[PDB]
Design a binder for this molecule. Structure first.
Ligand SMILES: CN(C)CCCN(C)[C@H]1CCN(C(=O)c2[nH]c3cc(Cl)ccc3c2-c2c(-c3ccccc3)ncn2Cc2ccc(Cl)cc2CO)C1
Ligand SMILES: [Cl-]
Ligand SMILES: [Cl-]
Ligand SMILES: [Cl-]
Length: 94
């Protein structure tokens, strides 16, 4: 869904995305997009934000993730939509 070149893009999360990443063990100040997505997956999984049955549906209206993304819920199958939301929360480095 997302070209490898884009997944490999180097980025610097803005402070609130950063603090969220670090809350699930992230150790750096910059990341590839692939790494950002990896840690956001850890966040969603460990906080159990996904629907019990249709586990690709994420509910975030009672979480800081909803504030960061600007939505109450989303589907994890929509990778471009997710990337678009994440780019509003970081600065591209390279
Ligand atoms: C409850 N289960 C269904 C969870 C299973 C979790 N998976 C083992 C991990 C494997 C790597 N994963 C993630 O990196 C991974 N990272 C994410 C970051 C965001 Cl913002 C949203 C979803 C994911 C996510 C993921 C999920 C997922 C994650 C948690 C709960 C429910 C489902 N299911 C497929 N993926 C893969 C995926 C979805 C969207 C996008 Cl843009 C990028 C990628 C990366 O391929 C999911
Ligand atoms: Cl990815
Ligand atoms: Cl990588
Ligand atoms: Cl998927």
């Amino acid at each position: 869904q997302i070209p490898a070149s884009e997944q490999e893009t180097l980025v610097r999360p803005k402070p609130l995305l950063l603090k969220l990443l670090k809350s699930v063990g992230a150790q750096k100040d910059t990341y590839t997009m692939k790494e950002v997505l990896f840690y956001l997956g850890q966040y969603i999984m460990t906080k159990r934000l996904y629907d019990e049955k249709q586990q690709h549906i994420v509910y975030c209206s009672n979480d800081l993730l909803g504030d960061l993304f600007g939505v109450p819920s989303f589907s994890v199958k929509e990778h471009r939509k997710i990337y678009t939301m994440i780019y509003r929360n970081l600065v591209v480095v390279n």
